[PDB]
Design a protein around this ligand. Structure first.
Ligand code: B12
Ligand SMILES: N[C@@H](CCC(=O)N[C@@H](CS)C(=O)NCC(=O)O)C(=O)O
Ligand SMILES: O=S(=O)(O)CCNc1ccccc1
Ligand SMILES: C#Cc1ccc(F)cc1F
Ligand code: NA
Length: 239
């Protein structure tokens, strides 16, 4: 951007230049699209037309962001390698746009009462990043008295991705940002059932992530990383 009033496309380009080489994707949305669907308890306390960006990591993030980050780290200091790596790149967004007020909420942040600061999947949905498939998206479901948690599916990565956080730009208002529905890439009831069951009941076998066949998966190494318990992880990369 250069302008007296910065436009969404200029900002998106700048954030993408910063983040995309390192295996992230960014999707604009209005705060109102997020607040509309939510009770007052979960509302973001910003004007509705406030610009936000939903940020996710693709399979590439492991090799392009995390590995270089670990190599330049004092590994003894590190309690949360992935989170800190993502935090460093999110902080780089502030550096590329130093003139603008920016709030970042990461996916793992909670309020003192333990409620998530951002509902990542609702954000992913209204930003058109990934369709958020919920219990309500199955008519007359077979599941009875249990919690059926929802899951986002990306049209290119299927379930082989993660939502990393939201970048908010208070004072930049984009009331005419045109909304786009996420790709309904799991359209049939039978497939939504299999997807939700795979996510709620079988997530350790990975298979829910293939609910749409991906153009790219996590490598066998990245899979091994995330499925060995946190304490042994740096040993698995030989560090
Ligand atoms: C708490 C949590 C868990 C807990 C408990 C699971 C649970 N969901 O109860 C535990 C620790 C078990 C866990 C682990 C896992 N989960 Co988890 N975790 C979360 C977390 C931090 C909070 C989700 C939450 O509390 N939601 C609260 C409920 C009430 O939200 P909700 O059901 O969406 O309801 C709201 C919406 O429906 C909305 N709404 C109403 N109407 C409408 C209409 C529309 C159209 C929309 C869009 C919304 C909407 O209103 C409701 C609120 O009033 C999120 C990250 C985040 N910050 O959101 C992930 C998250 C859901 N988890 C994730 C994953 C991958 C997992 C694991 C697979 C991790 C792993 N081991 O690899 C496991 C799988 C186990 C499982 N979930 O069944 C990913 C899912 C990515 C995706 N969508 O593909 C998330 C998004 C985090 C991330 N970094 O990506 N998780
Ligand atoms: N907090 C630890 C653990 C992070 C972690 O294991 N996160 C998982 C759960 S969201 C993840 O990123 N997995 C990728 C995925 O689920 O696709 C860290 O920062 O390294
Ligand atoms: O500083 S707090 O607002 O308390 C926590 C915000 N988390 C965060 C900040 C910068 C980059 C990635 C994540
Ligand atoms: C949500 C969530 C979540 C975050 C970090 C982790 F190591 C496991 C999880 F389920
Ligand atoms: Na902060």
């Amino acid at each position: 951007s250069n302008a007296m009033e910065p436009k969404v496309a200029e900002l998106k380009q700048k954030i993408e230049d910063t983040l995309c080489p390192f295996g992230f994707e960014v999707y604009p949305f209005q705060v109102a699209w997020y607040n509309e669907l939510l009770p007052p308890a979960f509302h973001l306390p910003l004007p509705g037309p406030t610009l936000a960006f939903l940020v996710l990591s693709t399979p590439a993030m492991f090799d392009r962001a995390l590995k270089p980050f670990l190599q330049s780290c004092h590994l003894r200091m590190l309690t949360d390698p992935v989170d800190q790596c993502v935090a460093y790149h999110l902080g780089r967004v502030r550096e590329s746009l130093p003139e603008l007020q920016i709030e970042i909420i990461a996916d793992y942040e909670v309020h003192p009462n333990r409620r998530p600061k951002i509902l990542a999947q609702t954000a992913a949905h209204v930003a058109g990043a990934a369709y958020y498939y919920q219990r309500q998206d199955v008519e007359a479901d077979p599941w009875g008295n249990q919690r059926i948690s929802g899951v986002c599916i990306h049209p290119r990565f299927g379930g082989w991705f993660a939502i990393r956080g939201v970048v908010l730009l208070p004072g930049i208002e984009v009331p005419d940002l045109p909304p786009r529905k996420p790709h309904d890439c799991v359209p049939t009831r039978a497939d939504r059932i299999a997807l939700l069951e795979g996510f709620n009941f079988h997530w350790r076998d990975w298979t829910y992530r293939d609910a749409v066949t991906p153009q790219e998966r996590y490598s066998e190494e990245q899979k091994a990383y995330f499925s060995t318990p946190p304490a042994q992880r740096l040993a698995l990369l030989g560090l």
